[PDB]
Each structure stands twice: as structure tokens, then as C-alpha cells.
Amino acid sequence: CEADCGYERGPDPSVSLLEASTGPFSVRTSNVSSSVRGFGGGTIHYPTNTTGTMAAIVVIPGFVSPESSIAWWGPKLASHGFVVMTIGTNSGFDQPASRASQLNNALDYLIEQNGSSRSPINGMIDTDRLGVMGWSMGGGGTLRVATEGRVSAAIPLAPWDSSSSQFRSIDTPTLIFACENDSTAPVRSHADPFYDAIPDSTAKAFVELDGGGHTCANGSSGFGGSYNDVLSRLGVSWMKLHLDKDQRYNQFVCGPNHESDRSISEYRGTCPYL
């Protein structure tokens, strides 16, 4: 459904809530062995004190990178009312197109586990409200999955891919995080043309972060992590807005002056959405 569908959860939000180190819920974890079919294992994060179903999200890493490179997003998102699996790839050599098939395989796995007597998330997932996230080549895999129209939200992080024309099929709400000093996936050859290739009719957002390099959109529990608040405020809201059709989180994506944030170097968007 697109409006007043009854997927909303938690309080009416504010900025202090969004930028807290955790959402209103408590986080647990369930291991996925690397023997899992379709990807190289992961960790499932879930709230403990909620009711009702919730959207599923999968987060994939980039080239020769372990799941831990993006695993900050697992707890940060689960604590706001999501089921969130951070995954590892079959091989660190996997290129965008493989990383997209593994996105879909890990979404398929999550759907299977929602029906598994042995899963801590059995009956906790609405298997129609799915989101994807990815760093670098996994950010290209995210954009590729955003062309299929199964997922209702995509957040690429420092995306890397090779062809940009394929993204004119993207009708899925996509928020691309970019890093201004990205030498690995240069903005001007990657994030920038991927955003531009998305139709203006699609709800989309380009949030370039100020001064940061290739890992600036991954979050961090210690070293780095000056971007945690833009990531938390805009990422959680984007997922709350488009996975939970929760208009109460519209005010943080459409309405503010984003470049006024010291951490935001360039914002582009298509506000208003619907």
C-alpha cells in the first residue's frame, strides 16, 4: 500500500530520536553460517520488544571486503524496527552483477527464515516490504536490484558500477550516499551519473558527504564516524518513509536544507515524493 497502510511503529519521531546511538528497540543477533546457499553467510539483527511484522533489509559489502565493513548498519537499523541482515559475499572478487544476485539470494533466504520453526525472526517479517543496501560494488548491486522493482527502498553507499544507462529502469526510491574525496569510486564517474540516470519521477536523493573518502557512508563504532548522524537521520528516515510508508519521517528527507549540515557537501533530490 502507499498511504495510511498501518505499518507505522514507535513514537512520532524527532531529530534527537533519529540521532541517538540506538533506536527505541533492543537488538539481538543470529548467526548465518557461510555454508548458506546463495551468499557467504552473515548476521541477522532484530528488535526484541516489538509487535507486528516489519520490513526486511539486507546490507552487502564491496570488493575484497568483509561484512564487518558495513555491519554498523545492522544494529543501527534493527533498533528502529527492522529485520536487518548484514551479509558476506561468496568471493571478495565478486563484481556488481554477482553482488546483486547475492542480494536477491539473501532476500530469498530471509523470506525462507520467516517461515522457519528454527529462526528467531519466524513470523516477524512482512515479506513484501524489502530493502537493500550496499557499499561500492555492493552499491552497484543495490542499484541493479533497484531496477527489478521487488525492493521498495535502495540505499547505495559509495556505489561502484561500470554501466550507468542500466539505471534508467530505477522506479524504486533510491538514496545514494556519496563521498566527496572518493578515489576508489570517483563521484564524477559513479555516484553522480547513477543518480542522474534515475528518472526524475522516481523518489531519489543524492547526499554527498563533506570531505569523506570511500568508506565515509559505512558508519563506525569508533575510528572515523563523523557522519553517523547524517547516516542515521537520513538513512533511517528514508527506510521508515519508503518501507513503512511512514509519513511522520518525511520531515527529515523533504523540507530541510541539507547543505546547511556541516557533513553534507552537496544534496540533490526530487522532493516532493508522491
Author numbering: 17 to 290
What does the paper say about this structure?
As predicted from the sequence homology to the lipase and cutinase families, Ple628 and Ple629 both belong to the α/β hydrolase superfamily, and the central twisted β-sheet is formed by nine mixed β-strands (β1–β9) and surrounded by eight α-helices.
The main structural difference between Ple628 and Ple629 was the presence of an extended loop in Ple629, which is longer than the one present in Ple628, with the four extra residues S264, G265, F266, and G267. The root-mean-square deviation (RMSD) of atomic positions of Ple628, Ple629, and previously characterized PETases and other hydrolases confirmed that Ple629 is more similar to mesophilic PETases such as PE-H and IsPETase than it is to LC-cutinase and Est119. In this study, Ple629 had higher catalytic activity than Ple628 both on polymeric and oligomeric substrates. Reactions supplied with more than 1,000 µM of additional BT released less than 50% of the BT formed by subtracting the amount of supplementary BT. This observation indicates that Ple629 is inhibited by this degradation product. The activity was comparable to the activity of an engineered high-thermal stability variant of IsPETase, namely DuraPETase, and its variants incubated at 60°C, which indicates that Ple629 has enhanced degradation capabilities towards PET-NP.
